[model samples]
Target: NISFFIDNSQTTAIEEIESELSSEKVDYIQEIGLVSFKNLDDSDRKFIGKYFNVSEGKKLPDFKPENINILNKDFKSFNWPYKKILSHIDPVKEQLGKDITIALIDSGIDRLHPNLQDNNLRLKNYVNDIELDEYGHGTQVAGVIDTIAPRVNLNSYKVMDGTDGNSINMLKAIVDATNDQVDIINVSLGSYKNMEIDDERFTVEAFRKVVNYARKNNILIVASAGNESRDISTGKHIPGGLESVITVGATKKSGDIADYSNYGSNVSIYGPAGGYGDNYKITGQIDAREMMMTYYPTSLVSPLGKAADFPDGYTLSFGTSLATPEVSAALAAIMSKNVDNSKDSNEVLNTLFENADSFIDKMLKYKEVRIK
Candidate 1:
């Protein structure tokens, strides 16, 4: 039987109800929360709480209300790359994301972001103790998935906390999200050590079932290939290196691969991932010339600084960690455009790459890894 855990946002007094679960002697096993108490539920809800009526889900109101003035480029401190990402937005807008569900198997998301507040996205918690984002990693990744596409559902499967989570937690997060049937799975975090051929220590074998299950569910898994700058002459991180994942590598603003980016036949595409404060102006072909479209610039403002510094303009960083989001965001853009949420994964992927103007040469010129 499938189980569903409703978050507090969906109902009133949910926090009080969840707290009374054990004391009220509810009859459900296994509690799931995305952010402690925030994403909580009882197997037998009546045991601990009074019921409250809620309206059935409805479509988000159109924010594209008339008279919405377009902001000028004078927001100041514009990054060229971000401007480029925006330039390319129009051509792909129709292909962007929709009501599709994206599973984030990382530290968990910030359920409070206005960008993700209430567009029908659902979050699940694995660690029952804390259902919120204590660390900021998961929140950033979630933003990438949601910002590019408004209708996509983000399933927050909390895997780690202050420490980089373990293999069991990682596997559990994937399995949970897969069973829930997420369309796109983005794993932005990775460990320093690579998994061995048969080792279960954060290796492919341990998470094999859920990985395959995600594929079966038409879920395309994107992973941060890892941040180890050590010689590939030696091994690197697990899972990300495993054959099952669509491993992404990092490249600098110059479009050159990062010195630390893992190179192999595994890499599917290259994106602007480094020089952290970097931005991209996405453009597309219009009768043959790249035209201005939309932007993809990011801010560097610290999360704790001035409240005004929140989405601050742009910042810097390295590792495939940054690149994975760009790819996921691209996927979201495709999903957002298409209204049919039921399209098979293969069809979705093909449609997305097909619509991307830059995919033509890249798809055709792919090289192969040497068979050792």
Candidate 2:
């Protein structure tokens, strides 16, 4: 399969490309000037190169859900990440998240999960299919947001399948979220391998186009700094590395950087990702005991989860993926408190940063956002 962006502003760019492919058999042409990927031969590529950038469609590796165990040996032991990050508040009030909607763009949620099935939602599934999440990634993302902002209208746009997500599908999800007029979009996934849309040979113009589109419409995009621990300024992460994105990096329960989290000045905030490692230098290793609990589908729970004896409808997981939603939910909490809910994107961000915890971790460029 192949895809390319057509500059709609250029009449010749659109017409000339369409005219050349007239003689050959064609699959999909264009929608609103965005060409749908099709099975065209290299001859078309050779010709399209004269006008537009061309490339094979690629599925970037998604941040895998690390299903582990965090025992609730005692009442205070459970949800330590939430405890560390959100403990200042007495309880998570659903009304505080009222009149605000947050879109979770990742793997589909397990709608059957008891922990998340009862929330208010405007749009349940943006994709074509039944919003099935056999992979269990988006369910976790949704679970985290619901924990903090349970009453905010939660929408799910499933862009991931297994450990990878299609690039076009990801773009489609973001566009759909913007069309839905969502206040915040929590993207807990990113391209992990040399994939900056600005430079990473993977359709540099496409991501930049959609991100700007969303931003212009007053939508806040929160994404994860990848788990590879690479500096984000390079090609290691996308959407996160994008200058406009509110990029989130991972920190352990003690609020130090996570062992495998990518870091750089681009990382906007650090959130609790729940690691078992001591306060020493982060190791490349992972441990289950240090993990935090989130809602998970019991039917899809892994063998490791079974051995750890996690409850049927909930499990413990960790990653930069987990950290992003914390920031998203916190932002949603703050946004819900705004009078008449009329704040623009940057004002909501300013409120989040201006009231965040005092910066003590000068080592990493990220700060902590609390619901002050």
Candidate 3:
């Protein structure tokens, strides 16, 4: 089995390649040209590789969703998700990112949320059922993006269900998002175990291909660095280590790195998230105000078996998951500036990095980092 991209002008070459794999009964997905064959030898791989950038014998990695924990018991008066972070960035004069589309690939989203209702939002479910996000993580992530770059269209792809997601389905979701022509992809999900050191894991190679495809198509892929609080460079998580991606880490409301945020040269930037009591310690309300406020489903229940009631169906949360959407929304707002969307992903990222308010020259004994 192989996955590749075929140039439109190379239709004849593709036909020849297809005929060569007749006995293998090669099946092709036209949209992205990802193919599967029964049996393929080295010679067959060579031929396919000559015609297209073929990846043979590589399987999609099995991925696990990053852990998320929230401990807020009360809602704050101000909109910290917007007023605090959003106010820091200089607003674009043209109301940019109106036409840009942001693809949120996570558990799923509560499409019924008032903030999400009647907005330019699209939904796709990669799970074995309809689009329903009982997990509330995706909805919170979407709420952050919506609150920041409200004009950018929201394309929600449910590639995960609660705490689990496999690489194959996530890869397909990535391809589908690319085919959908989204401007940015916000992947607030990742795996923490069985990671490869200093390299991409074999299991994640397939998704890497799709990531490259997205890059070639001018799509920016943003992901959470991780919450393990370890050095991500030591082979801890994926997409975070993928160089093509902009990996984000979590920070506190005070602009300090969260105790649980993974750090390394792999991390691209930092965004505010809820801190634990260790980081946001206080007398009696230690964990009360440590989270960022965002939209959540009104009917959702908390992990503590308590009801989650908030004003306007909003709730408090934390993690790199929360941090990621801020960067994604910032990218969207940056892209929405000019007529031709002149800034590419790299430029926007550079602008964000260059313009960020530096926290420390070195944090966790690693390289420099900044907060937006």
Candidate 4:
């Protein structure tokens, strides 16, 4: 499948191209303003750049499930880590995240999940079928945002079906969310390719356009720095690698970078993800302090084939996946405050880092930890 961005300003050219492509029987088309997707023959693919003044066009790769990090360890009882996460933020009082709509672009979310019962919620599925949290990662991210900023409108964009998510669909979702005029976007997924070692500029450029589009339109984006535990500055991870995005690294309650977090100059901030705690056993399972507690599908079972231990519908897992939403919600909280309507993403980004708690890291620079 090929995802291409059209130059919508050239209305006549767009119409002519659409009619010609349809006449040639293009397999599929998702027309979202200047950005679009098409399943075209290899012969037709080369014609896009030459004829249309296309923004970006590249073959969408199969999304490997390397981005998500979920552990199956059993918890004897449930814990509300959001409480601890919330406590770290000063003067935690009721201030609904108003004027902010967070678009969660990941796997589906369990809309029926009790905690998510009533809120300004919207759903769109780019994968297949209605949005449902089969893998449970998206739901987890949603629960964190809701807990932190209860008043923010939560928009769920399902870009992945089961374990894997397509890059084409993911980009489509991002474009759609941007068009929808969301205030923020939280992406807990990432790619593992090292751009420095490989030649993937075609793929990189396509993603860069969409990300640039989001920034130009004033959408604040936050993504996980990845769980690979590598230096992302030398390596590559999008939208984290993108300068406009607020790349978040995982941290423990004590404010140290989590062992599983990818660190470098590219990482913009750190949020609590319950780092490797004292309870880490030889078997790889750790105590509740080392995990993030959030919503999971009610009937979802762990890889161990046992139901996740929850009295209602919640569970604990760990990764930068959990940290990204913390920063997202915090940004929403800041934006929802008594700020002026003229405040753009750059101002909000500066406010977050300027107000963040100072911490020294092995990266050797003063890294900002998310606080009030």
What candidate 3 gets wrong by more than 4 Å, as runs, is 1-59, 67-81, 88-96, 195-200, 279-286, 302-309, 361-372
Total backbone collisions for each predicted model: 50, 0, 3, 0
lDDT of each: 0.49, 0.68, 0.68, 0.68
Q: What is the lDDT of residue 174 in candidate 2?
A: 78
Q: Please provide, for model 2 over 1-372, each residue's C-alpha lDDT reduced to its tens digit, 9 standing for 90 to 100.
A: 355545557657757767878633332223323554445677877877776666544323333332222213342444778777666564344355766788888877777676665566444443346557767788777777877776677888876557665566667777888888898988887775544454355444556777777889999899888788778775346677677888888877666787778787888887887765663356755455577667776548654355556667666678888889888888888888785757878898888787667444426345876755
Q: Mind sharing the TM-score for model 4?
A: 0.80
> Residues 39-132, candidate 3, lDDT per residue (tens digit)?
6777777887776665433433456554111212233432444555555543333354678899998888888777786457788886657557
Backbone clash pairs for candidate 3 read: 61-203, 96-336, 97-336
- lDDT for model 1, on a 0 to 1 scale? 0.49
RMSD versus native structure for model 4? 5.4
Name every residue pair that clashes in candidate 4: none
